Design an enzyme around this catalytic site. Structure first.
Site, short mmCIF file in Angstrom:
data_model
loop_
_atom_site.label_atom_id
_atom_site.label_comp_id
_atom_site.label_asym_id
_atom_site.label_seq_id
_atom_site.Cartn_x
_atom_site.Cartn_y
_atom_site.Cartn_z
N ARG A 1 0.83 -1.20 0.00
CA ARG A 1 0.00 0.00 0.00
C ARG A 1 0.86 1.25 0.00
NH1 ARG A 1 -2.65 -2.96 3.93
NH2 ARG A 1 -1.78 -1.56 5.52
N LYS B 1 -12.69 15.97 3.67
CA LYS B 1 -13.72 15.33 2.86
C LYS B 1 -14.63 14.50 3.75
CE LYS B 1 -13.74 11.52 0.58
NZ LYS B 1 -14.45 10.24 0.27
N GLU C 1 -19.84 16.58 0.10
CA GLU C 1 -20.22 15.50 -0.81
C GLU C 1 -21.52 14.84 -0.35
OE1 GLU C 1 -17.17 12.62 -1.51
OE2 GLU C 1 -18.43 11.32 -2.75
N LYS D 1 -18.47 18.41 -3.91
CA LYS D 1 -18.22 17.15 -4.63
C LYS D 1 -19.55 16.47 -4.86
CE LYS D 1 -15.23 13.09 -4.74
NZ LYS D 1 -13.77 12.79 -4.80
#
Ligand SMILES: [Cl-]
Lengths: 329, 332, 330, 332
Positions: B46, B136, B176, B218
């Site tokens: 990762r 976010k 969002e 978003k």
């Protein structure tokens, strides 16, 4: 699903001549309360003090439920008897505090909001496995700050979200939107603010499809502000508080248990007593913490030889409020 | 306290010909990406992948911000220089996902809400110290489920709460409220639902005194449902989506960075391109995850010899969507 | 200023063993009634028919109020004394319909809203001068249309506006958000829509500082839809209705007077009687129009010889519903 | 029949560069006061003659795109016999009509007003449309000295949004005027906050009511300190605060924003508008003035037929000044 159970718990707690003993202090708060009598804040001393409370001789006559802190919900007497099991026989229902406390609300001027919905469905689920049968969540509104539209909104919105999560996990939600005592405001302003926050809290709960038959209310009484020069006797506090409740709580709600909020013990007793000279559409009782406990701590003084006298002090004040719950004081 | 920095950050992210690389995959979810190319989900794999993305040589011309997972925000390159220090030398703003995911909302019929407000003030303060500058938070509404009153309410309410908490911590909030593709609904039903949830979110944000000059949006594009009969090409989706935005987003909002949400890599670029044939009141760009990096995974295949070709594929798909941001996309 | 008298009036109207007789038909609507029994719609035949209702000899024993149309509030008996004075002699409070009727709501698909706020303050102030002491305003929601957010909103918003206006003019507002019977909906869906519209109406009324001690409610009972297969006996309409009322009405509200709305002259009694088997936090009674009036209409036939038999037919079905208010009906 | 396309055309015609609205919809009582100020009798003929004077001013259409008429004036004619609507059609001026029924005390407030008129509004606008009207006006208010209260602000926003849907369904473009009154000592920041809240509320209700934003016009108060505030605000600061407020609350689909003067001098009204048009705007920012356009006309007319042409020159001088301010070219 829990519908029968929730209605049952609410009826047991909303019993005649019985109220709630609030014991859900944090480990730190119980520490500050233990050092007032010079007792060290260990887990054993907290466990001992909590045992002292739940094993007081005739509590079940005047106490229908007890709000525990998470630590205490799993603890046992020195004998080995689980605390919730000791409560079950005195027919005292175990409840627990589930909110995560007050935090500054962004873009207000010093107003607070009550957090704790993250993970709340899982936490209430485990508390149900552990014997808890009702929950408690406390949010506040400040008259000196307004309250603002958004602060009053989050107090009511958070409560209604919590009430639905609690019922779906098997816990009867106690709904406490505390109109704080702070300020010089008169009793009419506190009546106005109480009516607004209750109308708003009940509207959101209806929106969330909370079952009113399976909730209890923990409001503050309608009283003037702490710094208001015009005071109000028990007759007035009773008249203003009862009309507020009759204007905002539908009869499907079984019980309403006031907080002391900075009154006397006698004032808390006279005010409740003045409200129970007549019948009421719901059970108007009490849910006190310091009002029932401060007599016990300074009588106990940490010494095991004062345990029986301290447990006796607990019952003298629990009976005085039960006398008030029926107007028999 | 951070008002001017929020404005400065929002203007750097919503800049001409640039967009956001959404990289905020879970450890579990990023594992699914790595399994799709036969790479085992270890921490070094990762970390190697994330290094590959943020160290792509020319990413700063087309990418203005990168949404990081919490673990990635603190990682470094194998050479030992910090990711956020890599991004700043390319004028890429580090961002951080701060919500705690979706959870069944009580007394609805299968609807979810987005949690994460508890402790959010302290997490964003720590993410700010670590160098993040925008945040976010993803909530959803399902048209097959309605959505219900209380589900759409909490989607808007939670986003407006989060937006204020983030701005006070110095993080530009990306807002969002994703209207999901699920269902058979036509594009008119999607536009109707989009207009409602955006009207509700903006009302609560106004109530919470969020500063609109320091937020980013978003949204999902305005499209027919995934299982809908009639379909819409780039011109109709641009027409319906711009109408939605013109009717609901005030001009103070500096940038609108769409999600792809289940369209192809090409469809995502063409839809964005069709929205930039004429000027817009705000910067209309992209915030893409599975679009931008899908070609990178298949070019990489976990092999160190493919690192340079995988980064070249990233810049190529980034350059396409940057071209689309200016309505200059040449699909030849 | 009117606070004390509003509380008195609401208590008088919410007396026990008594309900309200609704006679507030428009001149056009009442003419439709007289044509069905072969009578000519003149002002004198309307006045004669309304006198027949107001002058029923026993009435003031099962009827506490009567909702009047604006014309009837001002007309007198054949003797010459005003109808409002007959009502006070019988301890019946005069009421008045104050809305201006249903109109299509913009940008809905066939939903209505209730007109009437314009000039309402001055209209109610003069009705009070004319001796009216309570008012009525009827708005509707339609389950087959949802109801939509904005349609239910205006129904609750208008009623809360009217309630505040009527109280400041000295009239006890009767709050009637009628969930229509239309559709195939079951009892649970009517229960859900009823609980929503009442939560919304009481919230707005709280915002408007309406005094709940001086208002009256006129809801539709909680029943399945008119076109729904599953019926409901008096026992379960009673427990569905009372649970919804107990989940939404605060105890400060003195009275709840239901509308029949196309049940049956029989069924209206059976349902109300079933809700008075046990004590209620408020006076749960009746506010009926045709369920008290229709057999009066068909027995009178416009012929003055049958005035006595038609007035007796009024009292007989009045007591049937008053006995239902006491749970003691045959 | 659906008016969506004609509404959009009307709104774009009325919100045309370099033009604004002449508000001349005074009631018979109010216009009587105006005629008394210059000492003229309030007859029906004197109202008709003053209205003929305004509507017939030569070349007025180069600066005035619409005129808000009172109900009476909408059906009147010139002395020669030509309908006022036909004069305005020849002048390239759209006829508009006031449709509200005035302010009334709102129950259970401490001295606050609401605006009545919804009863019969649908039929009234239908008849106004047949008579030539193509846009409508509705004026509600909020008092800062009174808060405003929650229910007072709610009814202002709620009635406006209901009126806007009725008007559009009848073929009239609604002018949406929630006026924040000048009353009080409040500073410009308090005005800004109250403006922001009432516009957020009004736009939420309108979005709920499915009002078509492309076919509405706004008539706000400018953002200025209160009348009794000791701290003043010049044109540049008024422009900065007013445009910020609009940017934060008005979606770009709204074509035009036509301010009221509401208590400013003619010059400051013109300079304030001029300072808002030194750079481009996402919507047409213009004027909708009554007294600021009419006061010099009455003072110059004096009721005397020999002064008609000098009064029409006075109207044209003021209309041009504000048309110049709309383009930002008043001073230059
Ligand atoms: Cl101020």
């Amino acid at each position: 699903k829990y519908d029968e159970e929730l209605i049952k718990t609410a009826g047991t707690v909303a019993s005649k001549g019985r109220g709630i003993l609030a014991m859900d202090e944090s480990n730190a708060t119980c520490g500050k309360r233990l050092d007032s009598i010079g007792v060290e804040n260990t887990e054993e001393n907290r466990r001992a003090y909590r045992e002292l409370l739940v094993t007081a001789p005739g509590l079940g006559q005047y106490i229908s439920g007890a709000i525990l802190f998470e630590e205490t919900l799993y603890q046992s007497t020195a004998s080995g008897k689980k605390f919730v099991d000791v409560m079950k026989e005195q027919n005292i229902v175990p409840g627990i505090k589930v909110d995560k406390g007050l935090v500054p609300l962004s873009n207000t001027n010093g107003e607070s909001w009550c957090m704790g919905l993250d993970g709340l469905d899982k936490r209430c689920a485990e508390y149900y496995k552990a014997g808890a049968r009702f929950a408690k969540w406390r949010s506040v509104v400040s008259i000196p700050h307004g309250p603002s539209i958004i602060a009053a909104r989050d107090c009511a919105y958070g409560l209604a979200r919590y009430a639905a999560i609690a019922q779906n996990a098997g816990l009867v939600p106690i709904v406490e939107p505390e109109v704080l005592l702070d300020g010089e405001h008169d009793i009419d302003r506190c009546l106005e603010v109480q009516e607004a926050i209750w109308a708003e809290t009940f509207k959101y709960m209806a929106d969330n499809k909370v079952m009113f038959e399976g909730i209890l209310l923990k409001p503050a009484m309608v009283t003037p502000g702490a710094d208001c020069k015009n005071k109000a006797g028990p007759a007035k506090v009773a008249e203003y508080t009862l009309k507020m409740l009759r204007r905002r709580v539908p009869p499907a709600v079984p019980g309403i248990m006031f907080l002391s909020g900075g009154q006397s013990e006698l004032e808390s007793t006279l005010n409740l007593n003045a409200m129970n000279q007549s019948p009421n559409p719901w059970h108007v009782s009490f849910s006190y913490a310091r009002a029932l406990q401060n007599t016990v701590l300074k009588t106990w003084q940490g010494k095991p030889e004062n345990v029986q006298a301290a447990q006796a002090a607990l019952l003298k004040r629990a009976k005085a409020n039960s006398d008030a719950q029926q107007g028999k004081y």
